[PDB]
Design an enzyme around this catalytic site. Structure first.
Site, mmCIF file in Angstrom:
data_model
loop_
_atom_site.group_PDB
_atom_site.id
_atom_site.type_symbol
_atom_site.label_atom_id
_atom_site.label_comp_id
_atom_site.label_asym_id
_atom_site.label_seq_id
_atom_site.Cartn_x
_atom_site.Cartn_y
_atom_site.Cartn_z
ATOM 1 N N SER A 56 0.796 -1.366 -0.036
ATOM 2 C CA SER A 56 0.174 -0.091 0.022
ATOM 3 C C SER A 56 0.780 1.302 -0.005
ATOM 4 C CB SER A 56 -0.920 -0.080 1.282
ATOM 5 O OG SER A 56 -2.108 -0.965 1.091
ATOM 6 N N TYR A 69 -10.845 3.218 4.595
ATOM 7 C CA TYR A 69 -9.776 2.778 3.833
ATOM 8 C C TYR A 69 -10.063 1.861 2.645
ATOM 9 C CZ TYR A 69 -4.592 1.884 2.668
ATOM 10 O OH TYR A 69 -3.342 1.628 2.108
ATOM 11 N N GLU A 126 -0.812 9.811 5.401
ATOM 12 C CA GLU A 126 -1.549 10.378 6.828
ATOM 13 C C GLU A 126 -0.401 11.023 7.693
ATOM 14 O OE1 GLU A 126 -2.411 6.266 7.798
ATOM 15 O OE2 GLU A 126 -3.518 5.807 5.841
ATOM 16 N N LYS A 145 3.152 6.169 5.952
ATOM 17 C CA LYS A 145 2.193 5.139 5.229
ATOM 18 C C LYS A 145 2.833 3.952 5.413
ATOM 19 C CE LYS A 145 -1.273 4.311 2.413
ATOM 20 N NZ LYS A 145 -1.394 2.890 3.512
ATOM 21 N N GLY A 162 2.501 -0.534 4.393
ATOM 22 C CA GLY A 162 2.257 -1.273 3.331
ATOM 23 C C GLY A 162 2.265 -2.771 3.486
ATOM 24 N N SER A 163 1.279 -3.714 3.031
ATOM 25 C CA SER A 163 1.647 -5.094 3.154
ATOM 26 C C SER A 163 1.297 -5.864 1.780
ATOM 27 C CB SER A 163 1.124 -5.433 4.361
ATOM 28 O OG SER A 163 1.421 -4.700 5.633
HETATM 29 C C1 LIG Z 1 -4.843 -3.728 7.206
HETATM 30 C C2 LIG Z 1 -4.666 -3.955 5.786
HETATM 31 C C3 LIG Z 1 -5.535 -3.252 4.879
HETATM 32 S S1 LIG Z 1 -5.217 -3.682 3.074
HETATM 33 C C4 LIG Z 1 -3.680 -2.969 3.161
HETATM 34 C C5 LIG Z 1 -3.228 -3.060 1.567
HETATM 35 C C6 LIG Z 1 -1.899 -2.116 1.730
HETATM 36 O O1 LIG Z 1 -0.658 -2.568 2.040
HETATM 37 N N1 LIG Z 1 -2.365 -4.259 1.321
HETATM 38 C C7 LIG Z 1 -3.332 -5.278 0.525
HETATM 39 O O2 LIG Z 1 -4.510 -4.636 0.216
HETATM 40 C C8 LIG Z 1 -3.221 -6.611 0.441
HETATM 41 N N2 LIG Z 1 -2.634 -7.194 -0.641
HETATM 42 O O3 LIG Z 1 -3.073 -6.657 -1.785
HETATM 43 C C9 LIG Z 1 -2.136 -7.400 -2.824
HETATM 44 C C10 LIG Z 1 -2.768 -7.135 1.735
HETATM 45 C C11 LIG Z 1 -2.834 -6.722 3.080
HETATM 46 S S2 LIG Z 1 -2.312 -7.978 4.070
HETATM 47 C C12 LIG Z 1 -2.132 -9.075 3.208
HETATM 48 N N3 LIG Z 1 -1.641 -10.642 3.666
HETATM 49 N N4 LIG Z 1 -2.337 -8.853 1.785
HETATM 50 N N5 LIG Z 1 -2.644 -3.380 3.722
HETATM 51 C C13 LIG Z 1 -3.082 -3.856 5.113
HETATM 52 C C14 LIG Z 1 -1.850 -4.439 6.016
HETATM 53 O O4 LIG Z 1 -2.078 -5.131 6.924
HETATM 54 O O5 LIG Z 1 -0.742 -3.680 5.810
#
Ligand SMILES: C=C1CS[C@H]([C@@H](C=O)NC(=O)/C(=N\OC)c2csc(N)n2)N=C1C(=O)O
Length: 358
Positions: free
Chosen positions: A65, A150, A271, A312, A314-315
């Protein structure tokens, strides 16, 4: 070495990152810090387990993210170029959606998570036709502008609209215009063949090696692969530290504050929290991705500030990333990992490292 701040910074970072990696079973990390106009990059562990490959200066990580901030920077670039007005409706720019709920959703709403679109793209939407059908049928639970939810879908629309206003695809806008102008030459939405040897594997909850699966509007919301060095350059650009005029204006204008929600000010995807920063409020402010909160407009918008902590997270399935910086102190940090470990730990380690830097 005695009497040099570099050895002291390396000690701080090592002493936090080594136990973090041990207890979360994180194979590899890169941490990049900037302070006093100087850059420091520290690499730990393995980019891949088998055949094993170390994290190096060239290692590419998924940043998930953090990709949203590049969609915001593109929209801001379109705005300062006179091609995009953030107050206009989404359907103004996407005429397929005229007559739908998007007649009452602004581009600013999708750029600040206040449209009410849900977090995740519905799994069965595979193509543009299905996407538009979903969007034309959609109705928010609350009026656009009243709550913060979000959203990967809203971010996808922000990037799509910005790219179209510039007359190019999103992928071209990012890889042929934005990243080159920022001097980020080892940042990609699609990793080229000569860099595949540098693309770290992520390790999921079963410790299997994984790479992100790019689906519709995923480039906008989670598609960027980059080095910590390139993202440190992005952090410096966001603080005006580099020569690189419209690009600097675009970067700075993404830090405009548009809504308050909980402990945070919502900018254009970024943010921000007040500086000096309360660790409890920083933790609360980074636990807002999956629930709805009340959003209160800031009007006139708060100009980009120096005395704030901008961040910010991201994951992806295999990766965890964090960026934070404080313009007033010209300091920032990038933490990249090839395991998704909890955000409270990312934020606490970052807070401890930046607090040590004066
Ligand atoms: C709580 C969320 C909302 S989605 C948001 C988004 C941004 O990084 N990531 C994803 O939408 C996502 N995969 O997209 C390919 C995701 C988050 S956690 C995970 N196992 N995949 N990430 C998180 C996080 O744990 O960092």
């Amino acid at each position: 070495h005695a009497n040099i701040d570099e050895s002291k910074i390396k000690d701080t970072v090592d002493d936090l990152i080594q136990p973090l990696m041990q207890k979360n079973n994180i194979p590899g990390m890169s941490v990049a810090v900037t302070v006093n106009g100087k850059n420091y990059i520290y690499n730990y562990g393995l980019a891949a387990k088998q055949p094993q490959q170390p994290v190096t200066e060239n290692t590419l990580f998924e940043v998930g993210s953090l990709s949203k901030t590049f969609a915001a920077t593109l929209a801001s670039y379109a705005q300062v170029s006179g091609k995009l007005s953030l107050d206009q409706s989404v359907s103004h720019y996407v005429p397929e959606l005229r007559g739908s709920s998007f007649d009452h959703v602004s581009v600013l709403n999708v750029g600040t998570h206040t449209s009410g679109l849900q977090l995740f793209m519905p799994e069965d939407i595979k193509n543009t036709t299905q996407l538009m059908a979903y969007l034309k049928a959609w109705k928010p639970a609350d009026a656009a502008g009243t709550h913060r939810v979000y959203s990967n879908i809203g971010t996808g629309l922000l990037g799509m609209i910005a790219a179209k206003s510039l007359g190019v695809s999103y992928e071209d806008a990012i890889e042929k215009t934005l990243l080159p102008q920022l001097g980020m030459h080892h940042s990609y939405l699609k990793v080229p063949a000569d860099q595949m040897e540098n693309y770290a594997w992520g390790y999921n909850k079963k410790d299997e090696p994984v790479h992100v699966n790019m689906e519709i509007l995923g480039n906008e919301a989670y598609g960027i692969k980059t080095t910590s060095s390139d993202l440190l350059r992005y952090v410096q650009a966001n603080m005006g530290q580099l020569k690189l005029a419209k690009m600097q204006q675009a970067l700075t204008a993404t830090h405009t504050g548009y809504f308050k929600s909980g402990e945070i000010t919502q900018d254009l995807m970024w943010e921000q929290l007040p500086y000096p920063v309360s660790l409890p409020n920083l933790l609360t402010g980074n636990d807002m991705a999956m629930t709805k909160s009340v959003a209160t407009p800031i009007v006139p918008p708060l100009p980009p500030q120096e005395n704030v902590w901008i961040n910010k997270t991201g994951s992806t399935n295999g990766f965890g990333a964090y960026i934070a910086f404080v313009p007033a102190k010209k300091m920032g940090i990038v933490m990249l990992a090839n395991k998704n470990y909890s955000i409270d730990q990312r934020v606490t380690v970052a807070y401890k490292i930046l607090s040590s830097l004066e």
